[PDB]
Amino acid sequence: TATFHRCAKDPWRLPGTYVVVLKEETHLSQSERTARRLQAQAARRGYLTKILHVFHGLLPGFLVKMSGDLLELALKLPHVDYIEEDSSVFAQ
Amino acid sequence: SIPWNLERITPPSLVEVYLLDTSIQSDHREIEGRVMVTDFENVPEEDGTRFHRQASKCDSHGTHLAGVVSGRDAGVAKGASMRSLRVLNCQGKGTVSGTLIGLEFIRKSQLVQPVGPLVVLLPLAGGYSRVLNAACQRLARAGVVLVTAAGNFRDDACLYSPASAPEVITVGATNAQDQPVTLGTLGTNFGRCVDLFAPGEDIIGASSDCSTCFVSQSGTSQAAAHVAGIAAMMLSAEPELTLAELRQRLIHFSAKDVINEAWFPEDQRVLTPNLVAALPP
Amino acid sequence: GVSDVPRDLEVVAATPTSLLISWPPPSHGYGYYRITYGETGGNSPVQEFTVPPGKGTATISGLKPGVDYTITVYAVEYPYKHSGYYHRPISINYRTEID
């Protein structure tokens, strides 16, 4: 079962945007399939979602703008390694 | 007379340096003709924000660092050619997601470009990120040299990303007196996640005020930019160097036991490397 | 760009708990001055606040009477505590009055 991760420093957290990371041993087309599946399942429950980006070559997964209420649902999706809530980065 | 930081790193071929950062002034005399502004942009702000900020063009941080790496008169590798990606906004802020998409863009560009040496400078930090550390690891595995700022938190670099990624060269900051840098009530990060230190206080470099201006800036961003410059010089001479081979050479040629470990917390002194970066002789 | 730090920091007034510092404001300020203060010889942890250069003044309140304090001003583009800084800092020493 997949894990949920977020920034330990609370003011830097960006709830509402998640990086859904999939297991490395998957097909290239599996990232898009799971994104589409998450969208369908969320819509059935009356939740709107936006897929901002589909990851290829670096790590397999996608970037989704959705409500945090859907994380329980999203963690049950097959091929999901973990889900990370977006956070801030700063010029040093 | 040379600037102190360029004296410090001085002992007694087609390398591309990718910078992820703010917008840059690509027509500054220091980097003109050797910096290309790519189409990549992923920032937490509206597109027109940087056109209606009467104050500035939001390019001061990026321009200085491009100058520290490759500046004709004040840079480490006067050679280098550089490629700019905009990931930090008008407030100096970015996202972990935007940095990921940028690293993904670099991977795609590496696959298109002919086999050659690639340096990636990440002069930014946030909290420890599992995904950002994973993306950095994968890029390193692909033979890319990644250089990041240790962070300006006067804390353990283990709590920060990309700082905490073992496959990334994590750089702390030291000054002209070989002391760790004080920034406000904070300063350079320390600990086992720091690979080495480099000049990061009173660093003269390109000012985006005008095409011939210079300004002094301090931070671990400047420290990391020195090491990206040193790595670019090293790869210009030996293009087939592994990341393990380059890291080995950085540690090897660095100045040793020169930092006053009294500025660090007692329990961190043994864990922090007492190395200041230098070029091979 | 980012305004230089003042050539001198002027201590105008001092009460047993407060310190008032002044500087000639720059013509066109950008962005902030980070004012850091603490007890000379690190008895206490260092404190800070950011101020636009154009204010020309700042009040350091909640101090201990009769102790020597060090005030360091840094020119900065971003006000968050972990930012880098521009130019050089300027420091002043001031002993606060007794009760």
Side-chain angles (χ1 to χ4, degrees), chain C residues 8-9 11 13 17 24 38 42 54-55 67-68 72 81-82 84 97:
Chain C
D8 308 273
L9 287 172
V11 170
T17 55
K55 301 291 189 76
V67 8
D68 228 272
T72 307
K81 303 194 187 185
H82 51 107
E97 59 184 45

Short mmCIF file of all heavy atoms in Angstrom, two decimals, chain C residues 8-9 11 13 17 24 38 42 54-55 67-68 72 81-82 84 97:
data_model
loop_
_atom_site.label_atom_id
_atom_site.label_comp_id
_atom_site.label_asym_id
_atom_site.label_seq_id
_atom_site.Cartn_x
_atom_site.Cartn_y
_atom_site.Cartn_z
N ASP C 8 26.39 55.15 7.92
CA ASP C 8 26.41 55.18 9.39
C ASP C 8 25.00 54.98 9.92
O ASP C 8 24.03 55.35 9.27
CB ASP C 8 26.96 56.52 9.96
CG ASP C 8 28.31 56.99 9.43
OD1 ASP C 8 29.36 56.58 10.01
OD2 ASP C 8 28.32 57.84 8.50
N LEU C 9 24.88 54.39 11.11
CA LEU C 9 23.61 54.19 11.78
C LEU C 9 23.64 55.14 12.96
O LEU C 9 24.59 55.15 13.75
CB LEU C 9 23.46 52.74 12.27
CG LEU C 9 23.19 51.65 11.24
CD1 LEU C 9 23.27 50.30 11.92
CD2 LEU C 9 21.83 51.83 10.56
N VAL C 11 22.23 56.49 16.47
CA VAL C 11 21.37 56.23 17.62
C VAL C 11 20.85 57.60 18.04
O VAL C 11 21.63 58.46 18.46
CB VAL C 11 22.03 55.45 18.78
CG1 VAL C 11 21.13 55.45 20.02
CG2 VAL C 11 22.34 54.02 18.36
N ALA C 13 17.66 58.22 20.01
CA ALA C 13 17.17 58.14 21.37
C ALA C 13 17.35 56.72 21.93
O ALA C 13 17.53 55.76 21.18
CB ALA C 13 15.70 58.54 21.43
N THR C 17 14.47 50.38 27.87
CA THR C 17 13.98 49.20 27.13
C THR C 17 13.95 49.38 25.60
O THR C 17 13.74 48.41 24.86
CB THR C 17 12.57 48.82 27.60
OG1 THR C 17 11.73 49.97 27.48
CG2 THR C 17 12.55 48.26 29.02
N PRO C 24 19.88 58.23 6.71
CA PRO C 24 19.34 59.03 5.58
C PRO C 24 18.63 58.08 4.62
O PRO C 24 19.25 57.11 4.18
CB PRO C 24 20.59 59.63 4.93
CG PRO C 24 21.68 59.49 5.92
CD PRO C 24 21.36 58.27 6.71
N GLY C 38 21.03 41.84 19.16
CA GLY C 38 21.28 40.91 20.25
C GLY C 38 22.28 41.47 21.24
O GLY C 38 23.00 42.42 20.92
N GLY C 42 26.97 37.06 22.95
CA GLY C 42 25.88 36.08 22.87
C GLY C 42 25.19 35.46 24.07
O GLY C 42 24.89 34.26 24.04
N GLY C 54 13.29 53.28 2.81
CA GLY C 54 12.64 54.60 2.78
C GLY C 54 12.09 55.14 4.08
O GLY C 54 11.89 56.35 4.18
N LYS C 55 11.85 54.29 5.09
CA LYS C 55 11.34 54.70 6.42
C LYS C 55 12.32 55.60 7.16
O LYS C 55 11.90 56.37 8.02
CB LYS C 55 10.97 53.51 7.33
CG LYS C 55 9.91 52.56 6.77
CD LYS C 55 8.49 53.16 6.66
CE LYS C 55 7.45 52.12 6.30
NZ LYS C 55 7.09 51.25 7.46
N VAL C 67 22.34 46.95 29.47
CA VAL C 67 23.20 45.95 28.77
C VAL C 67 23.65 46.47 27.39
O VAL C 67 22.92 47.22 26.74
CB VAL C 67 22.61 44.49 28.72
CG1 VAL C 67 21.19 44.42 29.23
CG2 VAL C 67 22.73 43.84 27.34
N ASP C 68 24.87 46.07 26.97
CA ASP C 68 25.43 46.41 25.66
C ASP C 68 24.81 45.53 24.55
O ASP C 68 24.84 44.29 24.65
CB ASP C 68 26.96 46.31 25.67
CG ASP C 68 27.63 47.54 25.07
OD1 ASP C 68 27.84 47.56 23.83
OD2 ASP C 68 27.92 48.49 25.84
N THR C 72 22.97 44.97 13.66
CA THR C 72 23.50 44.72 12.33
C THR C 72 22.40 44.85 11.31
O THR C 72 21.35 44.23 11.46
CB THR C 72 24.24 43.38 12.26
OG1 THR C 72 25.22 43.35 13.29
CG2 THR C 72 24.95 43.17 10.93
N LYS C 81 13.57 35.18 6.37
CA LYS C 81 14.80 35.09 7.17
C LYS C 81 15.93 34.31 6.55
O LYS C 81 17.09 34.54 6.91
CB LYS C 81 14.50 34.55 8.58
CG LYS C 81 13.48 35.35 9.38
CD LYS C 81 13.52 34.96 10.86
CE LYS C 81 12.42 35.60 11.67
NZ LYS C 81 12.54 35.31 13.13
N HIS C 82 15.63 33.36 5.65
CA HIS C 82 16.62 32.49 4.99
C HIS C 82 17.07 32.99 3.62
O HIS C 82 17.65 32.23 2.86
CB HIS C 82 16.12 31.06 4.92
CG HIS C 82 14.74 30.91 4.34
ND1 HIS C 82 14.56 30.38 3.07
CD2 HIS C 82 13.53 31.14 4.89
CE1 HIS C 82 13.25 30.31 2.90
NE2 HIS C 82 12.59 30.77 3.96
N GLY C 84 19.42 35.28 0.97
CA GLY C 84 20.71 35.91 0.84
C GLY C 84 20.65 37.41 0.97
O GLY C 84 19.58 37.99 1.00
N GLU C 97 20.18 52.54 28.71
CA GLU C 97 20.23 53.20 30.02
C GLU C 97 19.58 52.36 31.13
O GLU C 97 18.83 51.43 30.83
CB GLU C 97 19.65 54.63 29.96
CG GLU C 97 18.21 54.75 29.49
CD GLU C 97 17.69 56.17 29.36
OE1 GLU C 97 18.42 57.03 28.81
OE2 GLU C 97 16.55 56.42 29.81
#
